[PDB]
Design a binder for these strands. Structure first.
Length: 111
RNA sequence: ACACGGACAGGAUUGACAGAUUGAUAGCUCUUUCUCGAUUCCGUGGGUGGUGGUGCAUGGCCGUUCUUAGUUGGUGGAGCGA
């Protein structure tokens, strides 16, 4: 179910909890402070970015996958609702709020 | 300053060491290539700022006629009337 991206990300932007972007993801992985990693599977061909795929096998990070760039850019960050299209490709969530329905679905996804 | 659109987390873009530059220890810019991460940059519209004009569009205030001793109603008289 997709409330593992609806109930954590929209409640996570309000708390200085997003590290959105790609080089900031590399500096956040070297901080050892990645707790939640939303990848991309949308690319020109996906073999061009292998750094966030391999630095978690050095750094023991949880990974949750998605297949989309534009619905990723509609999950997190800003947009007009002639429309301001930006697209996000990798998300490090650094911090959270206090949640009682959605701690587990980001927590227990270790398969 | 805002709004429309271009841009844009495959990064809008702020800061910056040495070296040319300069009168300069102005990342000013050019060489050079790191930091930052949607406040920000591109053209429009509209604005803002002015100890810039016109005291001959004006107020406020001040000088001067004048600190000389002048100025005006009401009822009554004069005049059709000023």
């Amino acid at each position: 179910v997709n409330t593992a991206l609806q109930e954590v990300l929209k409640t996570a932007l309000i708390h200085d909890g997003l590290a959105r972007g790609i080089r900031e993801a590399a500096k956040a992985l070297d901080k050892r402070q990645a707790h939640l990693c939303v990848l991309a599977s949308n690319c020109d061909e996906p073999m061009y970015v292998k750094l966030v795929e391999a630095l978690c096998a050095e750094h023991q990070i949880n990974l949750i996958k998605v297949d989309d760039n534009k619905k990723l850019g509609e999950w997190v960050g800003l947009c007009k609702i002639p429309r301001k299209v930006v697209g996000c490709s990798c998300v490090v969530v650094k911090d959270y709020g206090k949640e009682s329905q959605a701690k587990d679905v980001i927590e227990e996804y270790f398969k």
